RNA sequence: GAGAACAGAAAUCUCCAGUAGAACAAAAGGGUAAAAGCCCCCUUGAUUUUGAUUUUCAGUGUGAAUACAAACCAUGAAAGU
RNA sequence: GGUUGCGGCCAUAUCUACCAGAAAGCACCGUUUCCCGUCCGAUCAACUGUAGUUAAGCUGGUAAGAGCCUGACCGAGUAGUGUAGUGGGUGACCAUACGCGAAACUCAGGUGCUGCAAUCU
C-alpha cells in the first residue's frame, strides 16, 4: 500500500489532449550526471512521480458511457468506459497552410451581379415524354445522346447550300458537343490561370 | 547467365515473404489499421493447419516482435478422448473452443488492470481471426475452429456464409448440416457409405475406428463428451518431458556436423 | 537414389491441342471432337497479336485445348502412340523432360468418321515430372526443385525406353 | 487515374491535418548503432513511418533542397537524418518542414553509453498507440532550444489526436528530462530520453478508483547533445500556428445553446 | 409535419410549402416505434400526400415504406 | 441522426483547466455508525465507532464478526437513509457529499446478495432458424443453460441446444399453435399446451412423447404450472396445473397420466394458474377476480379476491423463482437422491420464504385498469396496497428471484420497479418505444431484460435504475424473452420465426 | 532458351529462367509483384439526409447552394477500405 | 541443439554447385460420399496419418565462385569548400587563422542474429 498523492514543489501543468505532463522543478546535476550509478533509478523515480499525477488527472477526467452493443458504428460498446480528453493545450505547428478559399470564377461574379440563386441539383433523372421511362439527362446511357443513335434525323433546310450538306448530322452534332465540352474545359483553364 | 550488376541491383523481399508464410499486405491492416482512434489494442486468433495438427494462438503484437498470450493445439484431443483425425472439421472445432474456455479461464472472465479503476464489470474478449495464406471457402476447418472459439465464449466478428450448410441461392444456413458437420456427421456418413459400398477402401480408410472397435454411430457420443470434458478442465497441462534441455542439447550436437576454423580451412586449401 | 521410388517418372499431364486459326463451324467442330476425345469440355484461347497475313484481328479465337490426367490420359496417350506406330524421333524430346508430337488425321485414334466432322491434325503434348512436382506450385512455402529430383531428357528417354521398348530416332 | 486523385487528395491540405508521417533517411557515413537507434525510433513512431535503404550525400546546414524534394516526394512533415563524423559522433539531425518546405531543423548527437532495445529484453506495449509524455525541466518551459525540443518531440510521438482515449491503451511513457539544470553563459546540458512501461497496482489508500504507477524501462536510453540549430522565421512561425476556425460556431454576444439546443438570447 | 420535401408542380411551391396531392412531407414517425436494424429510433419520414387538402378540409398522407 | 449539442468554447476551456483529484485525507476522523438490518429491522452492535478509512469490504467483514459467523459470512450491501448507497467507502459515498458527517451517527441498512455474478449480455451468440412460424413461447432447463424450449405456431416445439446453437430435438404431436412450454423442476419432463386444447408431455433427452396428449380442456391451454418439488414427496413425480380460456383449472397426475381435480369457479378465461409454496393455487381470470384454491381441501376455492375493475392479465408470486428451478442452483449441481432433492428445494424455498420472522409468499396482480395490486392471501383478504401509475395495461409482472422487488412491464412503453414488500413505487425504466411484451430477471436479482414491440431488447441495472445495454437484431416483434438459471444466456423469439440467443 | 502437323521471323500449347527490363500515373535522387498490373464475383446507391455548425444569396429570413461532421450505404469471414 | 506456429531487423539472409540430417516436427505422399472450385481433385476444398518415403521441399557444412556486410588512431581532419586582420602585387593568383567537411585506397574480418509459445530420443 504505497501512497498515491505526489508531493511537489512547483505544481505540474498538464497538457491532457497530449498526454503530457511538464514539472519545472529543480534537477541537480551531480544526481543526473553520467558518472553517478543512481541516475537511472532518478530518472525512473522522477517520470514515476509525474506519470503518478498525470494518471491522476486522466482518471478524474469526466468518462463517456453507451448503451450501444458491439457489431454497429462507433468502437465503444456498453462494457467500455472511454475518458473524455480535453481539447490538447501544446501549441504545435501544423504541416500545411491553411487550404485558401478559390477567388470568385467569371461565372461566380456573373451570377452574384444578376442575383442568380443556385440550382436546387435534386438528380439527373429526367422523363421522356415519347416512353414511360425515366432516363438520366447526362453521362452513362443519358438523353443528351439519343439523337447519335435515333433511327431516322431529317436532314434541315438550312444546310442546303453548304458543303456540310452530305454530312451526317448526328455526326455534326458529336462534333458541336464536343467543341462545347472544349469551350467548357478552356474557360476552366481561364479561370485558373486568372 | 545472372550478372554481377544483376545479383547488385536485385532488392530482395523480406525474409517471411521468401519462406512465404506471412501476408504483409494483409498483416498490416490487421496490425496497423483501426476503426476508431481510441487506443484500443487488437489480438489475433491465428489458425493454422499442418498435415497432422491444428494450431490456435491468441497473439498480441508486440514493436519487438508479437506475444502469444494463449495456445491450444490438437494433438491434446486425444486427452480430452479424441485420438483419431484430428485434423478434420469437428477436430478444429474442438481445438477452437480448448482454446476459448483456455483464454477464459485464464483471463478469469467465467470461473491490476487499469480498466477496473474505471469501469465495474469486464470487457468480453474480442480477438480478430487471422487465417494466413488460406483460401476462404464455404465449409473450411478455419471457419469450423471460428465457430468452436465463437461457441466457447470469445468474440469474433464473423458472417456465417463460409459455415457448412449455408444456402448459396438464399442468404440463409442449414443450421442441421451445420451440427453434422460440428459432432461429425459427414465422415460417419461417409464411413457408413463405404462399409456398404466397398470393403477394400474401408479397410485402408478407418483402419483405427475398426481396430478401437468404434461403432459408426459413437461418434456425436465422444464429440459430445469430448466437448464437456474441454468445459470441464481447459488448462493447459505441460507435457512430462523425458530428457532435459541440456541432454537434448549433447544429443544433437553429436548429430550436428562441427565447425572447422579458418585455419583448417587455410590448411585444406594448401 | 535411383532405387528409391519416390524418384519415379510419371506421366503429369496431356495437352490436346487444336490451333484452327479461323474461329468458326470448323473450330465448334474442333472443340466437340476434343470434347469426345477426352470426355471433358475444352477451353478456347484468345488472340495474342494482329497479323493481316495471318488474318486475325485482336482478341479473337485462335485454339481450343484440352489437360487430361490419370488413367484416361493414359489410354488417350496409348491410342496416340498407336496410330504413331511405336516410332519416336530424339527431337520430340526437349530439354525439361516433357515432349510433344502432331497427329495429321485422327480418324484412326477410335473415332468413326462423320461427314460434318471432316478431317481434323490435332497435337498431344506429355508433361514429364516427378513426384513432389506440387512444391512449385501449392500457395503456402512455394519452393524451387533441386537439380537432382529435376527432370532431365536422358531420364525421360531412359524412362520410354523402359516402358514402350521404343527405339528413340536419331534421325 | 481514381486512385492517383485519391492520392493527391489525401496530400493535399486540410482544415484538420491527418497524423504527420517521419521519414528515416540514412546519410553517407552510417553505422550498426546509427541503423540499431533509427530501428529503435520507427518501432516508437510506427505505422506512420517509413524508411529509406540506401545511402544519401545529405548536409541539413549547406543545402535545403534534397530534404525539400525528399519531404515533397513522401508527403512526410518529419524527418530523421541519421549521419556520422568525427566532429559529430551519432548525429542524428530532426528535420520538420512547413509545406514541403525546411521549417526547422536540430541536431543532435547521441552519446555512446546508450542501451538498446533489444538489451532490457521486457515486455513491451502494443504497436502504434500514442504514448504518455513526461518533461523534466524548466528550460522545456523557458530556454528556446528546449523549448524547440519539447513542441519537436511532442510533434513527432503525438500520433493521432482524439477526444476518446481508452483506460487498456495507457501502455508507455516517454520522459525527457534535463541533465541538471543550468545558469546563462554556461554549456547546454544533454537531454535524457527514456522509455518506460506502465504497471498499475491496487494502492490500498486512494480506493479502488486510484491504483498505485511503477515503471519498466524498456529503452532504448538515449542521452542528446544539443549540437546545432536552425530556427524558423517569425512570418513562417505565425503561417504554422494560424487556425483555420470553420470548425467553431461562432460565438454571439447574449447567444447561448442550451442543454436542449435551443438558442437563446439575453436582454438587458 | 416536419418539412415540405418536394412538391411535384414546382420547386417554387416547394419552397413556399404547398401541399397538394402528391406532395413529398416529413412526418414524425416517434409514435409508431420504428427502430433501425443499428438500434436507432426513427422518429422522421416521408409521406405523399393523397388527396386535396382545399377540397376536403384535411391532409391525408400515405407513409413511404 | 439528432446529436446533443456540442460544448461551448467557455465549456472547453473550463475543460482544459485541471481537474481535482478525489482522494481520501489522511487526517479523517472516526464516525459512529449502527448497523441494522433491511429485512427484519435488528440492531447489531449498537452504534459503534468505525475509522473513516473503511472500505466495503472491510465493513461487510466486520459486521460479519459482529455478527458472530465469521466461519461462512454472507455479502452484504450497505445503504443510508434519502436512501443512497454505499459505493465504495463511506466518506466518498456520503460523508463526501456532506449529508452525513463524522459528528452525526450514520444508520446502515444492510441486505444480504448473491455470492455469484451475473454478466449482462451484450451480443447475439446466434441466430438459428428451424420454425415454420412465429414463436410463441420459450424456456430454459432448470438444471442446465444448454437446453431450451421453444413452442411455435407451426404446430411444433422445438429443443435446442444451446452450446453449440443448433437445434436437437422436434416435437411434433399438436395440431395446432403451442401456446406454452414448461420444464419441469425437476428437469425430467417438457409439457407443452396448445391451441388444440391438449396438453402433451415429452421426455426431452430423448425427444419423445410420453404416449398420449392430455385431453379435456374445451378451449386453449393458456398458462402451465407445476408442483413444487420441496412439496412433492420424495420418490413421487409432480403434478401439472393448467389453465384454459374455457374457465377451468385442471390437476393431472403423470405418473398415473390421469386428471385428479377440475377447478371451475371462474366465469371466463384464466389468464394464469400459479402453483405455490404452500399447497395453494392461485388463478388469475377475465373475471375481474383471483381465486385461490387449497389442494389439501380436494381443490375448494378458499378465496375469492375481488379489487380489479378489469381482467387480471398476470399474476405473480414471490418464490416463483424458487419454485421454478426446484432443487437446482446456479451452479448446477444436480442431487444425488431424490429424497436429497427434496431437502435441497426445501431449503432454496425456505431461504426466500422464511424471512423476518414468519414465513410470506407475497402474491401480485397485473391487471387491465392499469394497475396491479399486491396481496398477501394467507393473512387477509385485503390486497397490502395498490400499484398504480402506468397509463395503459400492465401486460407482465415478475418478482424478483430474492423477492425484494417487483418489475411490471405494460403496454406504454414503460417498465415501473417497486418495492417487493409494501408495493411502493421506486423507479420507472423508459426506453422502450413500442409495447412492452414481457420481462425476465437475472438469477442475482441485479439485471432486468424486456422484449418489445419495437424489436429490442433491452437490459436495465436495477441497482443504477439505468439502460444498460440495447439490444437489437431481431427483424419483427419479439414475443418471449428469457434468462438463464445460470445467467450465462439470454433466449429470445418472436414473429421473425428465428431464435436469437445472447450472451455476454 | 528448349520442344510441339499445317505454322517459316510474327497465329496456338508445354517446361525453365525471368526485380519487373512489361502496364498505370507522375517526371524520384527509392511509386506499385501473393499489386496500384490482368481476370472473375458483388454493388448501378453515389446528385442519400440530418445538422442550434462555416460561407453566399433572398421581400418566399426554419429555403437553397457551399464547407465540415454524423447517421447511413457498398464490400469482405474479418481486420478494415 | 533440432523442429514447428506467429514476428522484428529485411541479402551477414541473395544466386549457383556437391554432401549431411538419429529422434520429433514439417513436408512429399493415399481417396473423392460429404461442404467447395477448375478444361483437368494440377491449385483450391473435404477425409484417413491409414500404403510408403527423407528422393525433393526445409536446415546445416563445403567454394582463394558471383554478391552482400561491418570496424578502423587507413585515407583524413586531407581533398574540396566559405570569412579574415590593410597580407603582397596597377598584374592574371597564393601560404596563413577560424568554419563546414567526403569518396577512391589499404588492413583486420564475417556469411544470419534474435522475441513469444509449444514440442523432440
Known amino acids: ?194 | ?270 | ?171 | 487515374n481514381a486512385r492517383a486523385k485519391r492520392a493527391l487528395v489525401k496530400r493535399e491540405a486540410k482544415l484538420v491535418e491527418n497524423v504527420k508521417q517521419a521519414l528515416f533517411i540514412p546519410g553517407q557515413s552510417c553505422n550498426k548503432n546509427l541503423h540499431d537507434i533509427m530501428v529503435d525510433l520507427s518501432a516508437l513512431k510506427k505505422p506512420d513511418m517509413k524508411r529509406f535503404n540506401r545511402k544519401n550525400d545529405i548536409h541539413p546546414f549547406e543545402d535545403m533542397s534534397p530534404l525539400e524534394f525528399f519531404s515533397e516526394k513522401n508527403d512526410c512533415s518529419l524527418m530523421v537524418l541519421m549521419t556520422s563524423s568525427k566532429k559529430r559522433k551519432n548525429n542524428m539531425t530532426f528535420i520538420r518542414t512547413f509545406g514541403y518546405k525546411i521549417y526547422d531543423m536540430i541536431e543532435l548527437m547521441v552519446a555512446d553509453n546508450f542501451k538498446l532495445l533489444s538489451d532490457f529484453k521486457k515486455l513491451t506495449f502494443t504497436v502504434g498507440l500514442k504514448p504518455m509524455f513526461t518533461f523534466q525541466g524548466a528550460a522545456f518551459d523557458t530556454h528556446p532550444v528546449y523549448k524547440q525540443i519539447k513542441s519537436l518531440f511532442l510533434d513527432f510521438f503525438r500520433g493521432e489526436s482524439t477526444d476518446l482515449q481508452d483506460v487498456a491503451g495507457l501502455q508507455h511513457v516517454i520522459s525527457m528530462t534535463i541533465q541538471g539544470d543550468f545558469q546563462d553563459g554556461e554549456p547546454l546540458p544533454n537531454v535524457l530520453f527514456r522509455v518506460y512501461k506502465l504497471k498499475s497496482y491496487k494502492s490500498d489508500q486512494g480506493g479502488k478508483r486510484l491504483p498505485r504507477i511503477e515503471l519498466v524501462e524498456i529503452g532504448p536510453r538515449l542521452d542528446f547533445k544539443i549540437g546545432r540549430i536552425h530556427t524558423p522565421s517569425p512570418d513562417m512561425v505565425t503561417e504554422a500556428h494560424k487556425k483555420p476556425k470553420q470548425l467553431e460556431m461562432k460565438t454571439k454576444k447574449n447567444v447561448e445553446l442550451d442543454i436542449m439546443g435551443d438558442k437563446l438570447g439575453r436582454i438587458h | ?65 | 441522426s439528432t446529436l446533443i449539442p456540442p460544448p461551448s468554447k467557455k465549456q472547453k476551456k473550463e475543460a482544459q483547466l485541471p481537474r481535482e483529484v478525489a482522494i481520501i485525507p489522511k487526517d479523517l476522523p472516526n464516525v459512529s455508525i449502527k448497523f441494522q438490518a433491511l429485512d427484519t429491522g435488528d440492531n447489531v452492535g449498537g452504534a459503534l465507532r468505525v475509522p473513516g478509512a473503511i472500505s466495503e469490504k472491510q465493513l461487510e467483514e466486520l459486521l460479519n464478526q459482529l455478527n458472530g459467523t465469521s466461519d461462512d459470512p454472507v455479502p452484504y450491501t450497505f445503504s443510508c437513509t434519502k436512501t443512497i448507497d454505499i459505493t465504495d467507502n463511506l466518506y466518498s459515498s456520503l460523508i463526501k457529499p456532506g449529508y452525513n458527517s463524522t459528528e452525526d451517527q450514520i444508520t446502515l441498512l444492510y441486505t444480504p446478495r448473491a455470492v455469484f455474478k451475473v454478466k449482462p449480455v451484450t451480443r447475439s451468440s446466434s441466430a438459428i432458424a428451424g420454425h415454420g412460424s412465429t414463436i410463441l413461447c420459450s424456456a430454459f432447463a432448470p438444471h442446465t443453460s444448454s437446453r431450451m424450449v421453444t413452442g411455435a405456431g407451426d404446430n411444433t416445439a422445438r429443443i435446442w441446444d444451446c452450446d453449440t446453437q443448433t437445434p436437437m430435438h422436434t416435437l411434433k404431436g399438436h395440431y395446432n399453435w403451442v401456446l406454452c412450454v414448461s420444464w419441469s423442476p425437476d428437469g425430467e419432463v417438457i409439457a407443452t399446451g396448445s391451441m388444440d386444447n391438449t396438453i402433451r408431455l415429452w421426455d426431452p433427452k430423448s425427444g419423445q412423447c410420453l404416449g398420449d396428449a392430455l385431453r379435456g380442456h374445451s378451449k386453449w391451454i393458456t398458462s402451465l404450472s407445476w408442483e413444487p418439488i420441496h412439496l412433492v414427496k420424495p420418490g413421487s413425480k409432480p403434478r401439472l396445473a393448467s389453465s384454459s380460456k374455457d374457465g377451468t383449472i385442471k390437476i393431472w397426475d403423470t405418473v398415473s397420466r390421469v386428471c385428479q381435480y377440475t377447478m371451475s369457479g371462474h366465469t371466463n378465461s384464466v389468464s394464469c394458474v400459479k402453483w405455490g409454496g404452500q399447497g395453494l393455487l392461485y388463478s388469475g381470470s377475465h373475471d375481474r377476480t383471483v381465486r385461490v384454491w387449497d389442494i389439501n381441501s380436494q381443490g375448494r376455492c378458499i378465496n375469492i379476491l375481488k379489487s380489479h375493475a378489469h381482467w387480471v392479465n398476470h399474476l405473480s408470486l414471490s418464490t416463483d423463482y424458487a419454485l421454478r428451478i426446484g432443487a437446482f442452483d446456479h451452479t448446477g449441481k444436480k442431487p444425488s437422491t431424490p429424497e436429497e432433492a427434496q431437502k435441497k428445494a426445501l431449503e432454496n424455498y425456505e431461504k426466500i420464504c422464511k424471512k423476518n420472522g414468519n414465513s410470506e409468499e407475497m402474491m401480485v396482480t397485473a391487471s387491465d385498469d392499469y394497475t396491479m395490486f399486491l396481496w398477501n392471501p394467507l393473512k387477509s383478504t385485503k390486497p397490502i396496497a395498490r400499484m398504480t401509475g402506468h397509463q395503459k395495461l400492465v401486460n407482465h409482472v415478475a418478482f424478483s428471484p430474492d423477492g425484494r422487488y417487483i418489475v411490471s412491464a405494460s403496454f406504454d412503453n414503460s417498465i415501473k420497479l417497486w418495492d417487493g414488500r409494501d408495493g411502493k413505487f421506486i423507479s420507472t425504466f423508459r426506453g422502450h418505444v413500442a409495447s412492452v411484451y414481457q420481462v425476465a430477471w437475472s438469477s442475482d436479482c441485479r439485471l432486468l431484460v424486456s422484449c418489445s414491440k419495437d424489436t429490442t431488447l433491452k437490459v436495465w441495472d436495477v441497482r443504477t435504475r439505468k439502460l444498460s445495454v440495447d439490444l437489437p437484431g431481431h427483424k419483427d416483434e419479439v414475443y418471449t424473452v428469457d434468462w438463464s438459471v445460470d445467467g450465462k444466456r439470454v433466449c429470445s423469439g418472436g414473429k421473425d420465426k428465428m431464435v436469437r440467443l445472447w450472451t455476454h
Open chain 5, 1 to 65: 409535419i416536419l418539412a415540405v420535401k418536394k412538391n411535384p408542380q414546382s420547386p417554387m411551391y416547394t419552397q413556399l410549402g404547398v401541399l397538394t396531392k402528391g406532395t413529398i412531407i416529413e412526418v414524425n414517425v416517434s409514435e409508431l416505434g420504428m427502430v433501425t436494424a443499428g438500434g436507432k429510433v426513427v422518429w422522421g419520414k416521408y409521406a405523399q400526400v393523397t388527396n386535396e387538402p382545399d377540397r376536403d378540409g384535411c391532409v391525408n398522407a400515405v407513409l413511404l415504406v
Open chain 3, 1 to 171: 537414389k535411383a532405387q528409391n521410388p519416390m524418384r519415379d517418372l510419371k506421366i503429369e499431364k496431356l495437352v490436346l491441342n487444336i490451333s484452327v486459326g479461323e474461329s468458326g463451324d470448323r473450330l465448334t467442330r474442333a472443340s466437340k471432337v476434343l470434347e469426345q476425345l477426352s470426355g471433358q469440355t475444352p477451353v478456347q484461347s484468345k488472340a495474342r497479336y494482329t497479323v493481316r497475313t495471318f488474318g486475325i484481328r485482336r482478341n479473337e479465337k485462335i485454339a481450343v485445348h484440352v489437360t487430361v490426367r490419370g488413367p484416361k490420359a493414359e489410354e488417350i496417350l496409348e491410342r496416340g502412340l498407336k496410330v504413331k506406330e511405336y516410332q519416336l524421333r530424339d527431337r520430340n524430346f526437349s530439354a525439361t523432360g516433357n515432349f510433344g508430337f502432331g497427329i495429321d488425321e485422327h480418324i484412326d485414334l477410335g473415332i468413326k468418321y462423320d461427314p460434318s466432322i471432316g478431317i481434323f491434325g490435332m497435337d498431344f503434348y506429355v508433361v514429364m515430372n516427378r513426384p513432389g512436382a506440387r512444391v512449385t506450385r501449392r500457395k503456402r512455402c512455394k519452393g524451387t526443385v533441386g537439380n537432382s529430383h529435376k527432370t532431365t531428357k536422358e531420364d525421360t528417354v531412359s524412362w520410354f525406353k523402359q516402358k514402350y521398348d521404343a527405339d528413340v530416332l536419331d534421325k
Open chain 2, 1 to 270: 547467365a545472372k550478372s554481377s550488376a544483376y545479383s547488385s541491383r536485385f532488392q530482395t523481399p523480406f525474409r517471411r515473404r521468401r519462406e512465404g508464410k506471412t501476408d504483409y499486405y494483409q498483416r498490416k491492416r490487421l496490425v496497423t489499421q483501426h476503426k476508431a482512434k481510441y487506443n484500443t489494442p487488437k489480438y489475433r486468433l491465428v489458425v493454422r493447419f499442418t498435415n497432422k495438427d491444428i494450431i490456435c494462438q491468441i497473439i498480441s503484437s508486440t514493436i519487438t516482435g508479437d506475444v502469444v498470450l494463449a495456445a491450444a493445439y490438437s494433438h491434446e484431443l486425444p486427452r480430452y478422448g479424441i485420438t483419431h483425425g484430428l485434423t478434420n472439421w469437428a477436430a478444429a472445432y474442438a481445438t477452437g473452443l480448448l482454446i476459448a474456455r483456455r483464454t477464459l479461464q485464464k483471463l478469469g472472465l467465467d470461473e491490476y488492470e487499469l480498466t477496473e479503476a474505471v469501469e465495474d464489470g469486464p470487457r468480453p474478449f474480442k480477438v480478430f481471426l487471422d487465417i494466413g495464406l488460406q483460401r476462404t471457402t464455404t465449409g473450411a476447418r478455419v471457419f469450423g475452429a471460428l465457430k468452436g472459439a465463437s461457441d466457447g465464449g470469445l468474440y469474433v466478428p464473423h458472417s456465417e456464409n463460409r459455415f457448412p450448410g449455408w444456402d448459396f441461392e438464399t442468404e440463409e444456413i442449414d443450421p442441421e448440416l451445420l451440427r453434422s458437420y460440428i459432432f461429425g456427421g459427414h465422415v460417419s456418413q461417409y464411413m457408413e457409405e463405404l462399409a456398404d459400398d466397398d470393403e477394400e477402401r474401408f479397410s485402408e480408410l478407418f483402419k483405427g475406428y475398426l481396430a478401437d472397435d468404434i461403432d459408426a454411430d459413437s461418434l456425436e457420443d465422444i464429440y459430445t463428451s469430448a466437448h464437456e470434458a474441454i468445459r470441464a478442465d481447459p488448462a493447459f497441462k505441460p507435457t512430462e518431458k523425458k530428457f532435459t534441455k541440456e541432454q537434448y542439447a549433447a544429443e544433437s550436437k553429436k548429430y550436428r556436423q562441427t565447425k572447422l576454423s579458418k585455419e583448417e580451412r587455410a590448411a585444406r586449401v594448401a
Open chain 1, 1 to 194: 500500500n504505497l501512497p498515491v498523492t505526489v508531493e511537489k514543489p512547483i505544481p505540474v501543468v498538464y497538457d491532457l489532449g497530449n498526454l503530457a505532463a511538464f514539472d519545472s522543478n529543480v534537477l541537480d546535476k551531480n544526481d543526473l550526471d553520467s558518472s553517478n550509478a543512481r541516475r537511472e533509478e532518478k530518472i525512473k523515480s522522477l517520470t514515476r512521480d509525474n506519470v503518478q499525477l498525470l494518471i491522476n488527472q486522466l482518471l478524474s477526467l469526466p468518462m463517456k458511457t453507451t448503451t450501444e452493443s458491439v457489431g454497429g458504428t462507433g468502437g465503444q460498446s456498453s462494457v467500455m468506459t472511454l475518458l473524455q480528453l480535453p481539447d490538447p493545450t501544446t501549441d504545435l505547428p501544423r504541416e500545411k497552410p491553411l487550404p485558401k478559399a478559390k477567388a470568385m470564377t467569371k461565372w461566380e461574379k456573373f451570377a452574384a451581379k444578376k442575383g442568380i440563386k443556385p440550382k436546387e441539383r435534386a438528380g439527373k433523372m429526367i422523363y421522356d415524354e415519347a416512353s414511360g421511362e425515366w432516363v438520366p439527362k447526362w453521362g452513362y446511357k443519358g438523353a443528351n445522346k439519343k439523337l447519335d443513335d435515333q433511327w431516322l434525323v431529317e436532314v434541315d433546310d438550312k444546310v442546303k447550300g453548304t458543303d456540310n450538306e452530305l454530312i451526317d448530322p448526328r455526326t455534326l452534332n458529336r462534333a458541336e458537343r464536343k467543341r462545347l465540352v472544349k469551350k467548357n474545359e478552356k474557360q476552366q483553364r481561364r479561370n485558373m490561370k486568372n
